[PDB]
Every structure is written in C-alpha cells, then in structure tokens.
C-alpha cells in the first residue's frame, strides 16, 4: 500500500486556482504541495500497512478479572459477557458504529495461598473449569452442582503450569453486525430501559476449582483477553472526549475541549 | 451556473437561487431493498408518491445568544400526512431521506451554521445514573434546543445539553466526519443533504428506534448592526425517499 | 514417534501473535453479509477529513464554542499578528484533540504533509488580505511580518470563494518524526499576519471571525502503534 509521490513543479502565472476553494460544500480539498510551490520529484517508499483496520484492532486486550476462593462459601465466579468495563478497548471499538469480527479468547489463571492454620500444607497442581452458559441455559448455584456436567455447553479444563488456554469464536449475532450504539428503547411504549443495554444478550461465563479443598484455602484469579480477527467496520465516528462513567449507558459529565494556553500568539 | 438547483419529489418542488453543492450520503443513493438481502416473506407496500414528498417542519428563530437545535428524524414525521399513518398500521419499514435547511439574510448580516446528520446519536442524561425520558429526547416536529451552560445533577431525568460536547460526549469540532454542510451567510443560503438507510438490520421498527439525528449548531453567532432586521428564522424540510413497509396489523 | 525439539519461546503468550486455534462452536452458520453504506478500510481515511481546530484557548474559552473562532477586527496600525502556534500534531494542545491529532496519539511515528483551511465567517461587504506563513525550525518564532515573509507563505484575498488552503510541506532531515514533544525532531511554527486591513462600510459590524480546519494529504503515514494517554480508569465501570 505505497503512498503517492510528489511530482516536479514550475513557476506559474495563470487563472488556475488550486488554493482558493469553498469549505461550505462539505468537501475536503484534494490539493497537493506541488500545486502551491516548486517541489522536486521524490518517490515515496512509505506504506500504509500498519494503519489498516486489521492491524489496528487485532491485538489482545484484558476485559475483566474475577476472583473465586477455594474451600469457602461462594467459591465460583460469573460474568455477563460484554466489552464495556475497561477504558482502552471501549474507546477503540467506539470509533466505528457497526463491527463484525471473530474472536480469539485467551485466559490467564493465577493463584495465591491464603493464611491457613494447620502445619505442613503440601498441595498438588490445581485444575480449573470455565463453562460458558448461552442465554437461557441452566445456571449453577454452588460448586458441587449438576450444571457442571457440560453435556452441551462448551467448557475448557486446564492444569496449572502449562500454556494458557485459547479458543476461537465465530460471529455469533442475530443481526448483520455488532452494534456499539443503539438509539432506542426495548418496549414499544417507549418506557423502560434505553440505549445499548437492550441489544446485549451474549451469555454468562462461570469459573470454579475442580479439585476439592484439601488443607489450605487458595484464592485464584482469571483474566480474560479478547482479540478480534477478520474485522469489517462501517460508519466511522469521532472519538470520545469525556471520561466514561457507567457500563450500561453513555452518561458523562461535561469537560472542556482542550487544555488552555496563555495567549493566541504563544508558542 | 452551479448556484441554482431544483428538486422535485411527488407534488412538491424546491427551488433555490444561491446554494452550495448537494451532499449525497456516504456516496450511495437511496434505493429499494434487494431480493438477496430481504428477510421478511410477505410483500411490501410501496406507495411512493403519497409518502415521498417534502414535509416542512416548524420554524425556529436564530437569536444572538442561541446555542443549537436537534431533531430525531423518523419521529418528527410521525404526524405528517400519509407517512405518519403508514408508520402506525405497519410493523417494519425502511426509508432514506433528503434534508433541506434554509435560512436567508442580507449582505449586512454575518454568521455560520453547521448542518450535520449523525446516525445513532445516543444522548446522555444529566443525572449520571438514570436515562433520559421520551419527552426530553424528541418532540413531534418541534426543535429541542441545546444550552451553553451545564444542566445540574439535581434534575432527575433530563438531557445533558452542554453544546460544546454535543450531548454525546465527543468534541463538537470533530463532528465534521458525519455527512454535513455549512451555511455561511456571506455566500451560502441553504444546505441540502441526501441520506441512505444506515442500519445493521435490513428493516427496523420506526417507533422504538431513531436511526438519524439532525443537528444545527451556530459556530459563529448571528451579528448585525442597528437597523437591520432582528428576526431571522430557520426552516427545515424533510422528504422520505424510497420507503416501504411490512407487517400490517392494528393501529397502535 | 517423529523426533522434535522445542525452541525458546514455547508456551508463552505474546499478545500480538498470528496463530490458529480450535473453534469452540463447530459447524456454526454465521448470518450473511449486508451492503451497509460507509465501509472504512484504513484509518488514514478518517485522518483525511477536515475538523475544526480550537486555536483560541484562553483559559475561559475552552468550555464554550468561542474556542474555535479567531477574532479579526479593523485595526489602525498595520502588520499585526492574528494567531500563531507551533506545529506539533500530537503534543501541542491546539492540534492535540482534533480528528488528525486523535489518530496520531495511537501511533508513535508520522510523516507527510498537513493541510490547513481557513474560512472567513464575516459579512458579505467586508474585504481583507492575510498572510499565512510557515517557518521551519532553527531560528526563533517570527516576530515581524518582515521575518515571516521569508518562509513558506501564501497571500489570501477574500471574496466570492471564502476559503484558502495553506499546505505545509514535508521538510525534515529524517523520514519520520516523533508524535511526542522532542527537541531533535521539531517541526516549526505556523503564524498569520494582516497584509492589509479589514475595510467595512457603514452599518456593518467590524468584528468578524475566522474558522480553521486541519487534515492530511495523500502522502501521510503512521507507524508503531501504542496506547493513547487520554483515557484513564481507576475502578471497573459498573
């Protein structure tokens, strides 16, 4: 994707006016610096490869991290899947209105020893299970449940010390593109909820320890990384100025356009 | 002369005398839905002379201390003729628009407007926990107007109408990425836009989704000497283009 | 039992790799594509659209619409300065927040020419001539019209067409420049001066305004993607 190169120019005295235009037509001027001054003929070998939509988005970014404690009440995690809880992936996906991609989903699982009381703990390696419940399925309510059979829900098992687990998910949607913005309601009476919380129905993600609690409590943590592949993007949009406030909606507190300087002529 | 145009749609005609060029969409013209993209099976209703004509909204006054206005676009024409009556008896529908803003003055007045048409403009509430209600987001062909101050958090359910953030949290200067046009009272007199149907689904319900928002923001304010005419109005006319509907049921 | 031998770099998670991975939903049928208007293929198409730049940062104008208007009046002396700012499109707070400066803050290197458009939002009976200059670094800031006419300038006559494009050229020793503020790769200054006055008739307001635009040419390019310093987070959004 090589960029355009400059051509040679000569002094002119004519009625052809490249500089004078009209910005009121909503049209950006296509002038080049060989039209207003004398340039020499260079040839550009610069490319526009690293500015593409594939190279700008296909990078892993953390979206959540949740902690579950082994051998204590409520030793399992859950997460209603969305991409609007972090600052740096929300600002990248919200430069476009409609997106259509695949995924490449990598988890990073750690552990830490809790302050036990008995002497001489000696634990084996730990095994974790990450079950994905689609919208409508039966959900677990404790650690030793029937819902972790995974006869139809997909799930991964992982033993500590190895490479991190990684799957790949196609374009799972009802429409023809994901929608980052939605100006509408849920009900037809135009009460109730408003915004992008209406369209988000993607499931739930549960995590637990497979191993039973031997002698000491253990608190683990799993971080979740998204990576869009095969991206198509439509209708660009100006980037967000203010800071984000909530998850479900686009509420904000106003801010100035830029930081200020002392004068209009100061450098 | 490239300064005159003439638009004709149905039994209505718009002539203009000094104007800029016309801006068409993202490069595409409004057409009908094709057969390899449709998802409903029953036959659509295309009346196409009764609903594709110029509907004129109400007029707003451009004051000196005026901040802006906005209209939600498939909602302002919900009580306009046979376009508002087809929207009630049907469940689905798709539409492209043509928009003609017109604001005339003399050679002794000065000012500037930005006429921009933004898709999926979600507005943010003043209180940082709730969402704005329906009456504050849009009125039936009446302009809801911005402010130059900040609406405080004690207002329970209102819209944040600080004009330099354009209600959506972005910088108002960067709004020239959407298809837009300026009205400079030095040279221009009217701004014309053509918008196709932009949505992630081929047909959508028109009563719980406003897929377009028209914003008019004065960047350089209106100014005149003493003696010139102080009342300067702005008038917006919208005409649907290539509309069709599915799913006929009772009135609602 | 084919004998293999594993190299360093095994079982690592490098966040910019290009591998294959087993699918979680086999034989899944995606919804077919649609012809949606306005498909963007490259981020250098967003940076080619002009956006209004807030030149008038004066400590009480940033939270208003008066940051975008450059004040222009009818003087009594000659050769005054209208505005002036250095040319740093990713570090100087004038060009920092515009649509060009928000794409440059995801990348580290940049190279190419930069357009600058000026619309005269005055009356229809007002005239005037301006001098739009650009000076490469090495000297100071030009302090006179005599010192700024020795650079790359253009004289703009207002009239029927109310716009003029000053295209700064690519004058640098290196092929690329740094987005951050650097003394080694400075880029110069952009100034504006009255050529003649603004002459207005009777019953016309003498205080006009000027808007300024900024975009990129067709030789613009960026490199070495990084993370933007403008967004921030302390706790999770809920």
């Amino acid at each position, epitope marked *: 994707a090589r960029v355009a190169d400059t051509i040679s120019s000569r002094p002119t005295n004519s009625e052809s006016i490249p500089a004078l235009t009209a910005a009121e037509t909503g049209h950006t001027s296509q002038v080049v610096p060989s039209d207003t001054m004398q340039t020499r003929h260079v040839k550009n070998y610069h490319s526009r490869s690293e500015s593409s939509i594939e190279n700008f988005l296909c990078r892993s970014a953390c979206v959540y991290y949740a902690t579950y404690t082994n051998n204590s009440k409520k030793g399992f995690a859950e997460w209603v899947i969305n991409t609007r809880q972090v600052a740096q992936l929300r600002r990248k996906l919200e430069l476009f209105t409609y997106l259509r991609f695949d995924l490449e989903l990598t988890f990073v699982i750690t552990s830490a020893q809790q302050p036990s009381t008995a002497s001489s703990v000696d634990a084996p390696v730990q095994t974790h299970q990450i079950m994905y419940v689609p919208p409508g399925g039966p959900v677990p309510t404790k650690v030793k449940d029937y819902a972790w059979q995974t006869s139809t829900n997909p799930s991964v098992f992982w033993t500590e010390g190895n490479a991190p687990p990684r799957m790949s998910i196609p374009f799972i949607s009802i429409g023809n593109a994901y929608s980052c913005f939605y100006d509408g309601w849920t009900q037809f009476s135009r009460n109730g909820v408003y915004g992008i919380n209406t369209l988000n129905n993607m499931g739930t993600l549960y995590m637990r320890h497979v191993n039973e609690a031997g002698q000491g409590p253990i608190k683990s943590t799993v971080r979740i990384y998204f990576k869009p592949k095969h991206v198509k993007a439509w209708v660009p949009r100006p980037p967000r100025l203010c800071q984000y406030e909530k998850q479900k909606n686009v509420n904000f507190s106003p801010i100035g356009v830029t930081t*200020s300087r002392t004068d209009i002529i100061t450098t | 002369s490239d300064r005159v145009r003439s638009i004709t749609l149905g039994n209505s005609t718009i002539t203009t005398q000094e104007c800029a060029n016309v801006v068409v969409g993202y490069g595409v013209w409004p057409e009908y839905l094709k057969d390899n993209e449709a998802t409903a099976e029953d036959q659509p209703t295309q009346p196409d002379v009764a609903t594709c004509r110029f509907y004129t909204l109400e007029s707003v006054q451009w004051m000196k201390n005026s901040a802006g206005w906005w209209w939600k676009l498939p909602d302002a024409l919900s009580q306009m003729g046979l376009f508002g009556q087809n929207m009630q008896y049907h469940y689905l529908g798709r539409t492209g628009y043509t928009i003609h803003v017109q604001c005339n003055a003399s050679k002794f007045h000065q000012g500037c407007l930005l006429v921009v048409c933004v898709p999926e403009a979600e507005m943010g509430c003043s209180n940082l*926990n709730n969402t704005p209600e329906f009456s504050e987001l849009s009125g039936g062909d009446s302009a809801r107007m911005f402010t130059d101050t900040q609406v405080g958090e004690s207002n329970a359910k209102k819209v944040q109408t600080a004009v330099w953030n354009a209600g959506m949290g972005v910088g108002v200067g960067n709004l020239t990425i959407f298809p837009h046009q300026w009205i400079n009272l030095r040279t221009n007199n009217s701004a014309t836009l053509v918008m196709p149907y932009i949505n992630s689904v081929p047909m959508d319900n028109m009563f719980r989704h406003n897929n377009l928002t028209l914003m008019i923001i004065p960047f350089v304010p209106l100014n005149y000497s003493e003696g010139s005419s102080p009342y300067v109005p702005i008038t917006v006319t919208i005409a649907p283009m290539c509309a069709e509907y599915n799913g006929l049921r009772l009135a609602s | 039992g084919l004998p293999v031998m594993t190299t360093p770099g095994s079982t690592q998670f490098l966040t910019s790799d290009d591998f294959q991975s087993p699918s979680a939903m086999p034989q899944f049928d995606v919804t077919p594509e649609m012809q949606i208007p306005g498909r963007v293929n490259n981020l250098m198409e967003i940076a080619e659209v002009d956006s209004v730049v807030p030149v008038n940062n004066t400590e009480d104008n940033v939270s208003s619409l008066k940051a975008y208007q450059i004040p222009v009046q009818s003087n009594s002396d000659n050769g005054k300065q209208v505005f002036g700012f250095p040319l740093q499109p990713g570090a100087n707070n004038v060009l920092n927040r515009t649509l060009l400066g928000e794409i440059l803050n995801y990348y580290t290197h940049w190279s190419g020419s930069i357009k600058l458009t000026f619309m005269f939002c005055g009356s229809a009976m007002a005239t005037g001539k301006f001098l739009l200059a650009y000076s490469p670094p090495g000297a100071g800031v030009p302090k006179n019209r005599k010192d700024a006419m020795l650079g790359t300038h253009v004289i703009w006559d207002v009239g029927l067409q109310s716009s003029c494009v000053l295209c700064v050229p690519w004058i640098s020793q290196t092929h690329y420049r740094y987005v951050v503020e650097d003394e080694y790769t400075a880029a110069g200054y952009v100034t504006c001066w009255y050529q003649t006055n603004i002459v207005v008739p009777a019953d016309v307001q003498s205080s006009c305004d000027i808007l300024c635009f900024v975009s990129a040419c067709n030789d613009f390019s960026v490199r070495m993607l990084k993370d933007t310093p403008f967004i921030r987070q302390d706790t*999770f959004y809920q």
Partner: antibody
Amino acid sequence: VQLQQSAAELARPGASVKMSCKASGYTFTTYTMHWVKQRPGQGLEWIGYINPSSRYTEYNQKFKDKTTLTADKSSSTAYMQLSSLTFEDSAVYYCARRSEADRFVYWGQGTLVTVSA
Amino acid sequence: DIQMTQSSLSASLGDRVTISCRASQDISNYLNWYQQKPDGSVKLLIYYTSTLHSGVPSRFSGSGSGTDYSLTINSLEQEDIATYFCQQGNTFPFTFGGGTKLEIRR
C-alpha cells in the same frame, strides 16, 4: 497522586474562613473535586463539588447559602469559603476526587475548623 | 434523599466480624464501604456490593442485595481497628452512613 490540604484555622462566629486542597500527580482540569464535612459526633455529610474546567458548582440543598467553591487551573488548587459562621460549623472538612460513577478513591487528610471567642 | 441507617461493635483478635447497614429503599447494588483510620485517613475498600479495590487485603468481603447489606472481616487483626461507613450512589445527593467503630473484647 495525592491531595494535600491546608492547616487548621480559627475564626470568630460570623467571620469567614477559606480552605485549600492542592492537587498533584494528575491533570487537574479533568475530574471534579468534592467536599465532605464530618461533625465530631456524627457521620459524614456531603457539601458539593466543582467542575474545574467550566467552574460549575452545585451544592447540597442545606449548604447553598453559606459555602462557595472556587478553583484555579494554573496552581492546581481548589478553595472553599464559609460565611456567617455559627457554632455548628466546627468539624473536619475533606476534599475528595470523584472516581468513575460515585466512588471517592482519593481523599485529603482533612482540616479542622473551630469557632470560639 | 435516602436515609442510610448503619453502632459500636466489639470483637476479639482472629475471629469473624460482620458489619451491616440498611438502606431506606432499593438502591440496586450501589454501595461503597470506606475505612477511617484513627488519625483521620479515609480510603475506599469495596466499590460495589462485593468488588474489592485494588490494594485491599483478602480478609474483607461484602454481600447483600436489595435493602440489607453487609461487610465481613473473617480474621480480625490489629490494623483493622477503625471506623467503617457505607455510602449509596443511586440518588442525588450522596448520603453516608453513621460510623461503626471496632474495639477488642476483653
């Protein structure tokens, strides 16, 4: 990043005291700065905030006519002035920087204000 | 205006401590717990019903839904003798709860 308050002050009943909360470690014109008051025999009580970018202040409905908040973008400082002082304004005043939705992640160390003769 | 009801709870070293505060109406899981040291330094502990702030030890945990909420310390140490408030974020203006100070048993 840390907020550093002024020292403890002392004034007559009916007088006026002006406090300070000098911020550092972050861009001052981004986040709003709130003020919380704690009487020594009760809990904490909200007063109001100020957007430093636009100088918009919004007070609590009980403190609307006594307090007044102000800021300056150069020296990275937020002030608060009390007026028509009674004996019920003897407390400790904290300045807090509001996080994402309703959270106060950073606090000042508090200034003690007392009135007597 | 939501009244946030919270007075002096006593516990010994190394046991399970539970602090509770009750809202006036439904606040929908918008609660924050703060800790005020006896020299006067306040810091955020739990910025949701249960989510811990980054830099808080694992002894603290929160629970509850609707109207009644709770805060639990499972192993009370010496540095946890302070004052704990709860704060709603559902309605303007923000209201804090009354304090609850800890003290050793015997």
